[PDB]
Structure 1
Amino acid sequence: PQEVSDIKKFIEICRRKDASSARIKKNPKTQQIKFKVRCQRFLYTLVLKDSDKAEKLKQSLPPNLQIKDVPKRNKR
């Protein structure tokens, strides 16, 4: 697992061809949001403060990338 501290680098990673899927994790106790993209070798995580612009980053993310919100319970 790798952490990305640059929005531009995260945008290029999400536009890589091997980016199979993406998910959004919300931590309201910490008041943060996490964008996790699943590539071939590494899972890349971008950590942001919970904000409207952090929500609008979805619009800058590519459309063909299947993005989903993490549920409260990881049901097996």
Structure 2
Amino acid sequence: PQEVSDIKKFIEICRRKDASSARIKKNPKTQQIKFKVRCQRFLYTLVLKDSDKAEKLKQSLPPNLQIKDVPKRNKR
């Protein structure tokens, strides 16, 4: 697992063809949003504070890549 500190590098990671999946995790107790992208070798996590930048990044992401919001319970 690798951490991305910055949204643009997160965007070209999502633009890469290795980018298998993408999800949004919201931590309300901590007041933060993590954007995670799963690629061929690594899972990249970008941590952002509560801002308009998360929702604006959500449309700024590629549309072919499926973006999913993490539910409260990870059901099997």
Tell me, yes or no, whether TM beats 0.5.
yes
- TM-score normalised over the length of structure 1: 0.95
**Aligned-pair CA distance for 1:53:** 2.1
Aligned structure 1 segments of 4 or more residues deviating by more than 4 angstroms: none
**Aligned-pair CA distance for 1:56:** 1.3
Q: 1:30 to 1:54 in 2, by over 3 A?
A: same
CA shift digits 1:25-48 (9 cap, x unpaired): 000000000000000000000000
Q: What runs of 5+ residues in structure 1 fail to find an aligned partner?
A: none
Distance 2:50 2:69 in 1: 14
**Aligned-pair CA distance for 1:69:** 0.2
Structure 2 SS opposite 1:37 = strand
Q: Percent identity?
A: 100
Distance 2:14 2:50 in 1: 20
**Aligned-pair CA distance for 1:52:** 2.0
Q: What runs of 5+ residues in structure 2 fail to find an aligned partner?
A: none
Which moved further from structure 2: 45-54 or 66-75?
45-54
**Aligned-pair CA distance for 1:8:** 1.6
Count matched residues: 76
